[PDB]
Design an enzyme around this catalytic site. Structure first.
Site, PDB file in Angstrom:
ATOM      1  N   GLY A  97      32.264  63.162 -59.652  1.00 54.30           N
ATOM      2  CA  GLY A  97      33.322  63.214 -58.676  1.00 54.30           C
ATOM      3  C   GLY A  97      34.653  62.928 -59.330  1.00 54.30           C
ATOM      4  O   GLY A  97      34.729  62.242 -60.345  1.00 54.30           O
TER       5      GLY A  97
ATOM      6  N   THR B  48      35.262  56.070 -63.168  1.00 47.40           N
ATOM      7  CA  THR B  48      34.721  55.620 -61.893  1.00 47.40           C
ATOM      8  C   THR B  48      35.852  55.056 -61.047  1.00 47.40           C
ATOM      9  O   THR B  48      36.614  54.195 -61.502  1.00 47.40           O
ATOM     10  CB  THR B  48      33.614  54.574 -62.068  1.00 47.40           C
ATOM     11  N   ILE B  49      35.964  55.569 -59.821  1.00 52.06           N
ATOM     12  CA  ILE B  49      36.872  55.034 -58.820  1.00 52.06           C
ATOM     13  C   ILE B  49      36.400  53.680 -58.327  1.00 52.06           C
ATOM     14  O   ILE B  49      37.188  52.942 -57.726  1.00 52.06           O
ATOM     15  CB  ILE B  49      36.970  56.093 -57.701  1.00 52.06           C
ATOM     16  N   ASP B  50      35.135  53.334 -58.587  1.00 53.63           N
ATOM     17  CA  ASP B  50      34.469  52.179 -57.995  1.00 53.63           C
ATOM     18  C   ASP B  50      34.772  50.865 -58.718  1.00 53.63           C
ATOM     19  O   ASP B  50      34.436  49.792 -58.194  1.00 53.63           O
ATOM     20  CB  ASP B  50      32.943  52.410 -57.994  1.00 53.63           C
TER      21      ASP B  50
ATOM     22  N   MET C 118      33.963  54.596 -48.611  1.00 54.32           N
ATOM     23  CA  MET C 118      32.913  55.328 -49.299  1.00 54.32           C
ATOM     24  C   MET C 118      32.617  54.725 -50.667  1.00 54.32           C
ATOM     25  O   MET C 118      33.478  54.112 -51.302  1.00 54.32           O
ATOM     26  CB  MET C 118      33.332  56.793 -49.470  1.00 54.32           C
TER      27      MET C 118
ATOM     28  N   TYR D 160      37.073  60.666 -49.163  1.00 54.48           N
ATOM     29  CA  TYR D 160      37.443  61.863 -49.904  1.00 54.48           C
ATOM     30  C   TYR D 160      38.945  62.003 -50.094  1.00 54.48           C
ATOM     31  O   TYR D 160      39.364  62.698 -51.020  1.00 54.48           O
ATOM     32  CB  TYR D 160      36.881  63.111 -49.200  1.00 54.48           C
TER      33      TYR D 160
ATOM     34  N   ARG E 158      40.074  60.579 -53.790  1.00 56.42           N
ATOM     35  CA  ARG E 158      39.562  60.955 -55.099  1.00 56.42           C
ATOM     36  C   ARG E 158      40.614  61.703 -55.903  1.00 56.42           C
ATOM     37  O   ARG E 158      40.652  61.576 -57.127  1.00 56.42           O
ATOM     38  CB  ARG E 158      38.299  61.792 -54.951  1.00 56.42           C
TER      39      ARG E 158
END
Ligand SMILES: Nc1ncnc2c1ncn2[C@@H]1O[C@H](COP(=O)(O)O)[C@@H](O)[C@H]1O
Ligand SMILES: Nc1ncnc2c1ncn2[C@@H]1O[C@H](COP(=O)(O)O)[C@@H](O)[C@H]1O
EC number: 2.7.1.90
Lengths: 420, 421
Positions: free
Chosen positions: B12, B135-137, B181, B303, B306
């Site tokens: 992603g 990673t966005i996380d 998310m 979404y 991102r």
């Protein structure tokens, strides 16, 4: 009675001041403290008149602070009125604090704000803590780790310059962007690198302890000419206002229009009046406009101080405000609240204020570092190796309508002017 | 002959992909390299056909990358097509990499994207492979606090979305249950919630037991609503990590997907993406609380984060990662990951980031023992251990929910054993 916590702001605002106010107030209220905020820093506290201070003092309740973490500026305003100078002004401040039964006194502001708190500092009667404020990123925090408000300021600057980058390519032109702030090059460099600007100049990159007006002109000049040699008669160059605080007598004299620089009564030059970008654009248009180059100055400064804080600064100032209340509880006093290594800790006054200068030490940009070298690689400029490139000098010299001999004579020395 | 640098994105997207692309491309071009970008990750390389590959590869020129550091997304698109599985697919990817004279190979993506890159390395000094952890996380095992690229942009946009919802929920009294998310970790949810001053955040890390019950999540939100009600406020915002779902029991998941069996992908791999955590909780809570005049609305945030344009912190970060990749190829490195630790960008070696049991890079969760987390908790609205022992307070919150204090304690007091205090 319920302990009273008094809060004020001093110096110029930085995004997140309201975050510190709220972080300390909401937690204080959870403990049952009464919180009051002084309007305009020490301005009215320096007078000593009790009913004048009461009239410029507000109850900081839940509803007043509940949602100011979203807001730039400071709801209790700020002032540069500092009692640090006079022993009487100090006595006047203490009289109002004691009269207000202020048990806990919290100042948020720059160097002069903290000196005021220390001069005004019975640790059981009161306890005093300052929260160091600077948008310039120039606290001696462990390198990299930012000061609050710096992220908000750098990001907004990046957005402003993005628009200028689009306008400069759409309608070919050079912008000379002056980033307000003379203490250090962090804000200028960060906006420039974030935005991909074609050049950035900060006082820290100059080897000599003093700067000549003409070396700055020539630095920007060579970049314009190199870009022009690649078919681009446009760009954006970011200048740190601190360049002027590092300029020689003669340089400063050229900057102010070949006239004796302005002067305050005590002889200290009034550098705020200088217009570094406007001056460099003047000179550069003289040298370069005959090639089809247009040059426009543009200041970025005041629109950044009270922008709404970005999330990093929201979290930062919430942790700083909490850490103030934690210091008060655990009995600390005469200390500064800083975040180092993810922890908010009260670093004692003595143990952080350099006694030589009588002020907290200044963290400038580290130009010997990997970060600074990377930023340089994406700028457009003439490196040492570039000058020793016969073929390259031939195109840029052609670009500026001059011989390769004149080009080297004029510009090659700049390798000794700024670090490579 | 000038060396060939090939670049692709997998997984992603996260804000700043274009920053890494341009950081590396521009520097490589200042060295005289040819640079190409494979479109849609490994999608067209797994096939092995060279005509088709040639069609979905582009020349990464100066003019293509000179201004993309402002832009979200990735100009060469991305894909989750991982050749990490079948060995046939991996020879194919290597036939094109060797057919294109690709000297240097840079992949930007998550666990499966790097696992893919490594497996194709295991190939002569003609090629050198490097992956850039994305990673966005924020769940990479970097030194604590230090962020992965894209996290700052995502947290900041989330704070802005939640700000609007905070104004709406107070102007027209209402509760929003915001679902952030991502099931890997609680960093994104906690960061958005704390920056925005949300009234509650719930993340999987704060639950003591390996497994979570649906009814404990409901009751945690319920207690916060009731406490705010007892303070005059029939409105608020609660942020929920989607990772609550990946920690739920069999019985909890059974209630989450309705009151039915959960969906399953073939091979039993449960289809957790279909869950609607915040919608489910919103249903149950309106059954319990609507009679109190409480309105509750789910809202997902995901979404739109991102491919947000990267904030300045991420623009700089990704510029430095892109530079550090070229610098690493130049020093003869290969089979390594580009990370920034302690302000320096260095090529950590893949063997020194891969946990043994999982085979993938160690996952860094939220540290709930830290001062940071405790600080975030104090500005939330919730019933602490002490609050449940406060008799006067328990009487106010119970009245707010129209129950006796004994019915309140019997229902909620046990939550002090469910989440850390
Ligand atoms: N000072 C500079 N900063 C950034 N890029 C540059 C600079 N000078 C040249 N380039 C670019 O580097 C690449 C190599 O150009 P050349 O020197 O003609 O091989 C081209 O894409 C140029 O536009
Ligand atoms: N769980 C909570 N989180 C944050 N603030 C709270 C919480 N509970 C009460 N407050 C606030 O704390 C202050 C003191 O509450 P009290 O203890 O009722 O006087 C008031 O401003 C309340 O609104």
């Amino acid at each position: 009675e319920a302990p009273v916590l008094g809060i004020l702001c001093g110096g110029g605002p930085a995004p997140g001041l309201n975050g510190v106010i709220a972080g300390a107030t909401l937690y204080a209220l959870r403990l049952g403290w009464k919180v009051i905020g002084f309007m305009e820093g020490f301005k009215y506290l320096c007078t000593g008149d009790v009913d004048v201070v009461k009239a410029h003092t507000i109850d900081l309740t839940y509803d007043i602070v509940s949602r100011i973490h979203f807001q730039g500026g400071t709801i209790i305003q700020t002032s540069r009125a500092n009692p640090r100078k006079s022993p009487e002004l100090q006595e006047n401040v203490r009289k109002c604090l004691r009269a207000l039964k202020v048990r806990y006194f919290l100042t948020i502001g720059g160097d002069d704000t903290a000196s005021s708190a220390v001069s005004v500092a019975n640790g059981n009667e009161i306890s005093v803590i300052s929260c160091p404020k600077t948008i310039d990123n120039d606290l001696p925090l462990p390198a990299d780790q930012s000061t609050f408000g710096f992220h908000t300021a750098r990001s907004l600057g990046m957005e402003i310059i993005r628009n200028l980058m689009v306008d400069s390519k759409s309608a070919p032109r050079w912008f000379l962007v002056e980033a307000m702030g003379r203490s250090a090059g962090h804000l200028a460099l960060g906006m420039a690198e974030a935005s991909g600007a074609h050049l950035c100049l900060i006082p820290e990159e100059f080897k000599q302890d003093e700067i000549e007006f003409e070396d700055v002109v020539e630095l920007v000049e060579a970049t314009i000419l190199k870009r022009l040699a690649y078919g681009k008669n446009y760009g954006v160059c970011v200048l740190a206002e601190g360049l002027v605080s590092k300029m020689s007598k003669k340089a400063l004299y050229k900057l102010f229009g070949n006239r004796e620089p302005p002067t305050d009564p005590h002889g200290h030059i009034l550098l705020d009046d200088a217009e570094l970008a406007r001056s460099l654009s003047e000179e550069l248009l003289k040298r370069l406009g005959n090639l089809g180059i247009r040059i426009t100055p543009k200041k970025i400064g005041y629109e950044l101080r009270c922008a709404d804080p970005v999330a990093f600064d929201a979290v930062y100032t919430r942790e700083l405000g909490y850490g103030a209340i934690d210091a008060f509880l655990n009995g600390h006093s005469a200390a500064l609240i800083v975040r180092e290594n993810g922890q908010v800790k009260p670093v004692q006054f003595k143990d952080l204020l350099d006694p030589a200068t009588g002020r907290v030490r200044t963290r400038l940009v580290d130009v010997t570092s990997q970060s600074f070298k990377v930023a340089r690689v994406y700028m457009w400029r003439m490196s040492k190796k570039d000058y020793e490139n016969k073929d390259l000098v031939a195109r840029v010299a052609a670009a500026g309508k001059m011989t390769p001999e004149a080009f080297t004579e004029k510009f090659a020395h700049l390798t000794d002017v700024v670090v490579e």
